[PDB]
Structure formats: C-alpha cells, structure tokens
Amino acid sequence: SADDRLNFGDRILVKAPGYPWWPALLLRRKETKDSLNTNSSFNVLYKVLFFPDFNFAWVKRNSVKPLLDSEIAKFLGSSKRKSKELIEAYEASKTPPDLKEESSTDLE
Numbered sequence: 001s002a003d004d005r006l007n008f009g010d011r012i013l014v015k016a017p018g019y020p021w022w023p024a025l026l027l028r029r030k031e032t033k034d035s036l037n038t039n040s041s042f043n044v045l046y047k048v049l050f051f052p053d054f055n056f057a058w059v060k061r062n063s064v065k066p067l068l069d070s071e072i073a074k075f076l077g078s079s080k081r082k083s084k085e086l087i088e089a090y091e092a093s094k095t096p097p098d099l100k101e102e103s104s105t106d107l108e
Contacts (some may be wrong), residue, residue, distance in 0.1 A: 006066060011067075011096065075090045
C-alpha cells in the first residue's frame with residue numbers, strides 16, 4: 001500500500017526491445033507461474049498499450065516507470081532533444097480518453 005501509482009488505464013513508461021523508454025498505457029496486471037506449485041519461479045508482467053501505433057507489450061514492472069501528465073507534456077515540450085517518432089509517441093499518449101473509460105465487464 002505504498003508507492004502505488006500503476007493501475008488500469010494509467011499512462012506508464014516502458015523500455016522497448018532495442019529502443020529507449022516508450023510511452024505506453026497500463027491495461028491489466030497478468031501473472032503467470034510454472035504451473036500450480038507457487039514455489040519455483042514467478043513471471044509477472046504489465047500489459048500496456050503503445051502509441052501512436054495501437055500496439056502493446058508484456059514486461060515486468062522493472063522495465064516500466066510511472067508516467068504523469070506534466071512529465072508527458074514536458075517530454076514533448078523538450079526543446080533540446082526531440083524526435084518526430086518520439087514526439088508523436090508522447091503526443092499519442094497525451095490523450096488519456098484514447099484508452100481511458102474502457103468499461104465492459106462480461107459479454108452479451
């Protein structure tokens with residue numbers, strides 16, 4: 001119950017394979033283990049959505065950091081080191097509604 005700032009529909013950063021930290025959005029916390037022994041090795045990750053390209057990734061919290069609104073707005077406002085692919089990325093995640101308000105619960 002401490003330092004808890006990573007929930008569903010929460011904009012978080014994640015290191016992409018080969019590329020630096022990319023702006024993603026946490027969807028759900030999926031946990032997987034060996035089978036049903038819970039005494040060997042656990043493999044928990046965070047299902048996040050990537051932008052602008054509507055994609056996703058599954059990695060541990062270690063490769064994921066908490067992202068805020070000011071931080072995102074700042075990253076984009078960086079008038080020192082910015083890339084078209086990088087800016088568009090943060091610009092895509094800058095709009096929470098894109099993913100936020102995703103209600104469903106069961107299917108018809």
